[PDB]
């Protein structure tokens, strides 16, 4: 589960919280 514990995959998840 890299997409949740890595740095660069945070700005991506920040866009899921503003588009849900």
């Amino acid at each position: 589960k890299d997409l949740l514990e890595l740095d660069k995959w945070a700005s991506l998840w920040n866009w899921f919280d503003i588009t849900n």
Partner: antibody
Amino acid sequence: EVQLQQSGAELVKPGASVKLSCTASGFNIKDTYMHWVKQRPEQGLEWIGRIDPANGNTKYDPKFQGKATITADTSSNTAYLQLSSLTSEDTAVYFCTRSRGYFGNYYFDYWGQGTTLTVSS
Amino acid sequence: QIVLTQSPAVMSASPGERVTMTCSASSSVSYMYWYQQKPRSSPKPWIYLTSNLASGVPARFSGSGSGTSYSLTISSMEAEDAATYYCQQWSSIPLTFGAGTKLELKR
């Protein structure tokens, strides 16, 4: 109030096996990961690896694999760290921490008290 | 393996003056994380996500940087800050630390 109860100091023989503990209190380990860090005395920190308490997602530093074995007990809420073939370079102090990934801002929020290990004959 | 070469490793500073310490990487990373460890104690987390303080960190501390340029600065230094401030990244595996800068007081 969150705490991580580790084990006590150890003294092993050059080449024997030894296991450390880290009893996490105040939270469920299944809601996060668990990381171990080795710190050589008077030196810096060295990341060992991690384990997902719920299922198999265990990672280690490729230079640390084979020597380290991180297990976990879901019902006991305690993370364990097993070592093998203890040498003089392995003589160090070992810590215990957690990381909630993206939801916990990655940073190691709560650390254990630290466990000192020594190897000699 | 992205490693962190931290500097200035050894330094001295009295109270009141500003203190800035960097932690550059061998490859571009997106965030830097700071940890303070006092002697005979577990490292307490300081700054996360480049420039976000922890619960007990005084507001005089602050981080900044981008890419491999990453540092930690103090507005005005106080007395209970003399310790090692290890850095860490979370952008690539294996996760690496810096060797930490030892902070001393200028007597």
